[PDB]
Amino acid sequence: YVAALFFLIPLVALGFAAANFAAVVRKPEGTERMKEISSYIRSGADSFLAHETKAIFKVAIVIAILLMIFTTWQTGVAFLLGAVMSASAGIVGMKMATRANVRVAEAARTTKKIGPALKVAYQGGSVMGLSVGGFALLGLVLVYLIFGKWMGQVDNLNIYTNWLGINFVPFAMTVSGYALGCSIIAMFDRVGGGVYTKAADMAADLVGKTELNLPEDDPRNPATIADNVGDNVGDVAGLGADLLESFVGAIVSSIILASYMFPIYVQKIGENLVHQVPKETIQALISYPIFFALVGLGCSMLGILYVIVKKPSDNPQRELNISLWTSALLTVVLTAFLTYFYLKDLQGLDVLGFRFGAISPWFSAIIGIFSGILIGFWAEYYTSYRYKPTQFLGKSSIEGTGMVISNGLSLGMKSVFPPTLTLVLGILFADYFAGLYGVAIAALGMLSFVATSVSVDSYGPIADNAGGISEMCELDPEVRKITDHLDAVGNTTAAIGKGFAIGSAIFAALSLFASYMFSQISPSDIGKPPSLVLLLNMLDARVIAGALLGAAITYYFSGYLISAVTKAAMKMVDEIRRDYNRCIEITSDNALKQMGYPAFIAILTPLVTGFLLGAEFVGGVLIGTVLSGAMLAILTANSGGAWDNAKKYLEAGNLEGYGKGSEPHKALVIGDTVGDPLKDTVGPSLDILIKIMSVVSVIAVSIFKHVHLF
Amino acid sequence: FLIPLVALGFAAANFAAVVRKPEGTERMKEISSYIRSGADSFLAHETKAIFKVAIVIAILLMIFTTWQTGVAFLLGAVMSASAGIVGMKMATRANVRVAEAARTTKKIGPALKVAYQGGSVMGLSVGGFALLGLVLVYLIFGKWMGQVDNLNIYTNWLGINFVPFAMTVSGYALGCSIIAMFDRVGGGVYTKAADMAADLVGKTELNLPEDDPRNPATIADNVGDNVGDVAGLGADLLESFVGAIVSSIILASYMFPIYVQKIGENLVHQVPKETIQALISYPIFFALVGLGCSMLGILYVIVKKPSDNPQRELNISLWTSALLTVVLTAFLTYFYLKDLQGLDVLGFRFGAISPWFSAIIGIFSGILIGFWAEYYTSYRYKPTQFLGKSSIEGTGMVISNGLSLGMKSVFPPTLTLVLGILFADYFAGLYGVAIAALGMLSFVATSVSVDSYGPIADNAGGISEMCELDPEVRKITDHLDAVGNTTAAIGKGFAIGSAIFAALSLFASYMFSQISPSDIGKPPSLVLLLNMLDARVIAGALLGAAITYYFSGYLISAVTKAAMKMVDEIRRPDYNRCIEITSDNALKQMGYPAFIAILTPLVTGFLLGAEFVGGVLIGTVLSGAMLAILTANSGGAWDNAKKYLEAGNLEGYGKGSEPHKALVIGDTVGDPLKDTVGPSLDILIKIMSVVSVIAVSIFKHVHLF
Ligand SMILES: [K+]
Ligand SMILES: [Mg+2]
Ligand SMILES: [Mg+2]
Ligand SMILES: [Mg+2]
Ligand SMILES: [Mg+2]
Ligand SMILES: [Mg+2]
Ligand SMILES: [Mg+2]
Ligand SMILES: [Mg+2]
Ligand SMILES: [Mg+2]
Ligand SMILES: [Mg+2]
Ligand SMILES: [Mg+2]
């Protein structure tokens, strides 16, 4: 059937990525200094990766075994599968980037054009994105075929109460386990890598660039080499894991909502509870998001491939925008086709709330797509030094140092509002079209072109490593400006991807609340009206108290991340004043020690809060987490991006009279070091925290809903 | 009911008593005259703006609902403004008298007593004016109009149906909130603009010394120290206090129509009118008892034998007020609530005594939160010591360590708050949550007094450096100034906690206001409902939190903009002239945040309904509480680490060293944070909830989408 043709789509993406990987291997690169530094960086990064992989693999095996014990073993198997896909994607992307960084500089040098270097860097980012999408969708489709169909978990479609009092549909619990594995792996990777990279980057910019009076990414400074290794570890690898986790979370949330809507819609006629929604429609709505994602990945591949050969571009950011818009529009049209196919076979629209049937979530998905682009504009508007806010930041650089720090904080806080307003409008439209299911489909649509998003975002760190190499080689200030412009475009794309991830995570968390109350279902409650069950009162002191807790945990979590980054930076900065391996070891030891706590916190918070106060309190905690995490993520992303791009703005001498030697440049470097643990470490960790906490709550609520101490 | 008059008379007697204290050296008199002139001019500008805004808002309240609502708005505004004016004038008079007591007697005791009397005038004025306005509201509207007697939802000429008394008390609280907003936002922007300008002129090539008479910004900085801590901090505390009492009253008034039972063909109120009236009057009597206990503690400390230890005396005042409130309110609660029918239906677990249990819980929560704030800001404890030691390692390192310190500091006080909320609820539902809110602020007078003691000490240390005081007397004044900064941090944390609980209770009262005539037949769980599974509640929740963040940022840019305008004005002596320029600029920039805080619930409700607004309130409360605790603790830790290195606790490094420069940069960063952003957040969380409570009766059914 056509299902096999769609199952081939992730495999086609992997083959295309291997060809791009072979193209970079075929690229000469090979600069003796760059080759030696890149080989050392690859050895250190792969060793750090291997150590972290062994430890996390042991812990993940334990968690999967616990999942098999508490709930069905297929759930633990899905947990392992998701962990495998995420781990593989990160490694593939990082190796491709380590090879590609030298190729970008050499391509810009040999052709004397920015276009070819842009193409090779975008190819590296595309390798990362294709690996992300293909691995996630391959694991998901294999799960669906093996457990849903071959085992018939969807066929029975019966909630089973196993030991410990957990009642679950087998297929729904399995997909929940897959999403949970992806979330745990992504959080571990991003936290450790980000702490390492941000400690190294902050130490380098603060002492080497400022105190040592050395250019950014100076070769003599050990913190600079540690920073480039960190860029590869945290910025390249963590990014793919975070984006993949958000994408998987959106899809899994839609699937869970659909799977749980089937047993819930019953009408008691003649003392008999009749399913208001037939099973076939529910199965179709379960399969719809997977085909949606496959179509979106195909459109992403088409857009990227067309853009690479379309035309040499003088502006990298413009080409990235072209790629994103093409992928989005192709997804829109082909999803219109898929949606038309689905609305033919949908006659239960009124019972599901769907205004235009399948077309309603498609509109919702379209809305989500549009919202992403609009958010992508706003973040860009607030992060790019071409626009008014970052120019205002440079004026504050003229106005004083405390003024710089204060105005940058103000800039991020001001930046939070417009994208959130656009997002609220999108939420309203998604609900108006197709209730909670269309909210989840809009979550999916926002990341429907996740491959292109990951590619455009990962294009940045390759440019950062290339700029570090150029600064080490003392490249011509015009060419150094070219690579710094590529790095600034990459930072802008990092902010854009952070916004995409947080917005999709919000929509997924809304659907996850719906699934949480879906899990709070009982056979007697199933007879009760569905709207009465789908109830989470804020007046109840438990729910309002939990919201305060989740907000406090979110803030306390943000400081613990900074304290970890500073502690390694503290040793490094004193180390520089007092040996690249020494700073690398300081960052590595601090990250490997600090990485354990945040994931354990994110996993154990719902259990403790539920066994202490019940399920309403846990719902409140989820609420507060969603809110504070979204806000802090947008703030940190946009503020750090604006700080770094203002530093690049003044490094490009756009500010008359003042250059790298001037004191405002040192103030901007300090501001960039302040925003570094924010944009690259705190913000993304917040959205990963939000989704992992929501998934854990959805799974574990069946125990402490009635087995709660107070 | 005579107790508020006793508090007002007690403040007047202390005002007359301290005025009789000698003013001493003519030079000190001139410096105090500069400070007083600047403060009075700032007052005049803000008061003119406040008069215009208050007239407009009161007229709108009279039109939308009932004239009593606008009159109550005006009454609350008047009481708050009078308390603020009296307190600030008292402090401006008291600074030189404290300095002269320390100089002439060469002793810490008498100067401490005079400074405490100066702060006590402000605290007593706050308490007396607030409680007097409340008693007047009840006497005129509850009884003469018979609004309490009927205790029935009333449809006005515009067709809006609302319980009259609850709407009126909401209007009174709104007036108090408007005065608090003006004071805290405008004054804080002014204070940090002046403080930054003084430190900046000291730092820059054109050097005017900090805490020096020649510098106009230094005089403006001292005026601001008095403005923010005397007027603004007390304003925040009074707003939270009024919010707690009003929330309890609203809860009872709306509990009357909510708890109705249809038996056969007759609808009988599950809660009789007597129980509702008793629960309306209970928070007022609790607060009156707390004010009496606060006056007793203040009187004991002012007349206690002179002691060399000031912090012990302030703690004695606080503890005496708290314990007397605990015991006397135990008696009040047991005797007043014993004869009531229907407590179990409203959440009283242990009968009549349960709300008192909640209130004492609140008291304990307040003291514990103050401890946490101190622990994270004071250099005596580990975090600020670690910040000062890390100062050797770099400037960005200092900034990052301070950010991490604040974010880590947020957690323990919030844990205390969560435990207190859970226990207060377990005792007596949401009404007892509000009663715990009240108990935590039951001794608000002593809190405001101890808080206003601080800025007088800051001005005294500034004067000692300005007047080149004798190293023994200058050392005495420096010790008092350090004690004042510590107490300022403690009071700031306490204020943040009070604002948090007040916003929570106001949300509860908002949803109680979401009662409808048809809804009364439905089970009480159905009306007292704000489902999160609704897509509108989650969408609003994100919005209010984003607005809270945007609200914090606009303030930071405003302080820098005003400081530059002042600095250019300084380049253009006439301290009143530069202070007036700063006042005009800050009052002009204040309009946008005020429009945000007031109009967000209006627009969001008329667009999407009341569930969206409830979500907005939730997210705003959460994010504002977090950012307030963060900023307060971070600024306190930065300033105390700078003093730690000024106190040479870091071996080898003193004033002028590079770690000291990093700490100075961190302090300049934290000044617009602890003194401007945080308190404005505490005002925002509460004011948005109040506006929602009032306007929900309109936009609950008049919403576009
Ligand atoms: K970046
Ligand atoms: Mg770099
Ligand atoms: Mg870098
Ligand atoms: Mg960069
Ligand atoms: Mg940098
Ligand atoms: Mg950086
Ligand atoms: Mg000041
Ligand atoms: Mg200062
Ligand atoms: Mg002063
Ligand atoms: Mg001050
Ligand atoms: Mg200070």
Swiss-Prot record, chain A:
Its EC number is 7.2.3.1. Mg(2+) 1 binds at D201, D205. This is K(+)-stimulated pyrophosphate-energized sodium pump. Has 16 transmembrane helices and a cytoplasmic domain that contains the active site. Pyrophosphate binding is thought to trigger a conformation change that allows Na(+) release. Has at least two binding sites for Na(+). Ca(2+) binds at D644, D672, D676. Pfam families: H_PPase (PF03030). Substrate binds at K198, K679. Residues 71-72, 153-167, 261-283, 343-357, 430-435, 520-540, 614, 707-710 are periplasmic. Belongs to the H(+)-translocating pyrophosphatase (TC 3.A.10) family. K(+)-stimulated subfamily.
